[PDB]
Amino acid sequence: AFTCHCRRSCYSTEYSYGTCTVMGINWRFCCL
Ligand SMILES: [Cl-]
């Protein structure tokens, strides 16, 4: 499985696969 969170910054165990927009702002779509 990939486990993904929308974050300001991806954690050191993750990479950025794309973006989320919520609350009018961008987040990164971070998965490990
Ligand atoms: Cl794969």
Order of strands, widest sheet: 1-3-2
Radius of gyration: 9 Å
**Number of separate helices:** 0
Q: Can you tell me the overall shape?
A: elongated
How many β-strand stretches?
3
Family: Belongs to the alpha-defensin family.
Subcellular location: Secreted; Cytoplasmic vesicle, Secretory vesicle
Organism: Homo sapiens
GO molecular function, one term: protein homodimerization activity
Description:
It is found in: Secreted; Cytoplasmic vesicle, Secretory vesicle. By secondary structure, the chain is an all-beta fold. It has one domain. The protein has strands at about 5, 15-20, 25-30. The chain has a three-stranded antiparallel sheet, with no helix packed on it. The structure holds chloride ion (CL).
